[PDB]
């Protein structure tokens, strides 16, 4: 089999075992998967040439997953650049940091009534984590004072994010995240902007796989579908069985739409400008993790259209090896290239759902 299929095959083997109980390596059986071969080869070319994106060096790693938002099907996944070894695309050992803000803080805040419009005012000013004198600093180290919720997301304020989680509460945030396939042994306010505050087993935290599936719920109206690498298995006895995810409601369509409208500005005028495409209706969010006690261990980007969701992680094998300079550009560029490939031959815009009304650049609940 081709090298570019190694990561996908590994996950196919795992899901076949989960769904049927058999190991396709020891038990003969035919399996039909959801990988888009051309898309997969394209992702490999994005990773391993200078055609689409320029890298600072050949050591910087990239790991991404592309999901079909309508059914959770994984169409492409590549865990590294330059048999069935560790697949970073599904590993939850790295911190997706600020990329956690939309699904951890804002989505549940809107879903549960903390905010009723994208114009609601919030206050970006010096703030400490609840119960401490430990300051929450914004990525740019500044404060913009009284601003709209939409601008808060546009410029990725950490202050506003942490106070939002405080309002949502650790219980509800946990439940909301669980509905999006993400979990932690225990929730803390630090999780408002981090997925790896402490070492945890594989089932907890974020990975490109989980993040792609999570953001797909935004794209499709609020429905969560588990990552699906297989659609059919034909066992040696002749029987043929199909596999598809029924889906569950993770958030109201009104919540999904509002979140989408704000993440559109992240790209058009905000921190996600590096992924902006004027001809495509898409929304996204940049992500950055931080060291303890400009450099960072991880730089992420997650974006989606009404058809696909793609989560991207970048960083070095040893987190202590920092991303620096133009290295921070890669995540958004990998996404930009892939989504172009996936959309240029396409790609409708979202339609404001029942229960919401528009007033200029903002959206409000009735």
């Amino acid at each position: 089999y081709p090298a570019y299929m190694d990561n996908y095959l590994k996950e196919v083997i795992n899901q076949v075992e989960q769904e049927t109980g058999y190991n396709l390596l020891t038990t003969g059986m035919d399996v039909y998967t959801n990988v888009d071969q051309e898309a997969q080869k394209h992702l490999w070319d994005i990773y391993n040439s200078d055609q689409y994106v320029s890298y600072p060096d050949d050591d910087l790693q990239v790991a991404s997953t592309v999901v079909d938002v309508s059914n959770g099907k994984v169409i492409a996944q590549l865990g590294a650049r330059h048999s069935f070894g560790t697949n970073q695309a599904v590993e939850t050992n790295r911190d997706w940091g600020s990329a956690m803000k939309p699904i951890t803080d804002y989505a549940p805040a809107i879903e549960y009534g903390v905010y009723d419009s994208t114009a609601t005012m919030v206050n970006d000013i010096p703030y400490n984590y609840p119960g401490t004198s430990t300051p929450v600093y914004n990525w740019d180290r500044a404060y913009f004072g009284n601003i709209t919720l939409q601008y808060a997301l546009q410029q990725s304020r950490n202050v506003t994010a942490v106070e939002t989680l405080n309002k949502v509460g650790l219980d509800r945030a946990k439940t909301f995240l669980n509905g999006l396939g993400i979990d932690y042994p225990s929730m803390h306010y630090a999780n408002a902007i981090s997925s790896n505050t402490t070492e945890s087993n594989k089932q907890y935290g974020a990975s490109s796989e989980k993040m792609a599936a999570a953001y797909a719920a935004f794209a499709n109206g609020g429905i969560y579908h588990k990552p699906m690498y297989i659609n059919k298995v034909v066992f040696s006895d002749g029987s043929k069985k199909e596999f598809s995810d029924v889906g569950t409601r993770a958030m109201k369509e009104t919540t999904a739409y509002m979140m989408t409208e704000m993440m559109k500005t992240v790209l058009a005028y905000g921190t996600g400008r590096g992924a902006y495409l004027p001809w495509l209706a898409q929304a996204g969010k940049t992500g950055t993790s931080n060291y303890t006690d400009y450099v960072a261990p991880d730089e992420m980007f997650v974006g989606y259209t009404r058809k696909y969701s793609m989560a991207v992680w970048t960083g070095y094998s040893n987190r202590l090896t920092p991303i620096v300079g133009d290295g921070f550009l890669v995540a958004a560029k990998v996404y930009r290239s892939m989504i172009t490939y996936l959309s240029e031959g396409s790609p409708e815009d979202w339609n404001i759902p029942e229960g919401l009304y528009r007033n200029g650049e903002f959206v409000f609940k009735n």
Binding site: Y1, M5, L9, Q37, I75
Partner: peptide, 15 residues
């Protein structure tokens, strides 16, 4: 022998 196919049902691997 386990044959794997892509989303267009074309063979991509034999494991």
């Amino acid at each position: 022998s386990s044959k794997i196919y892509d989303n267009k049902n074309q063979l991509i691997a034999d494991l």
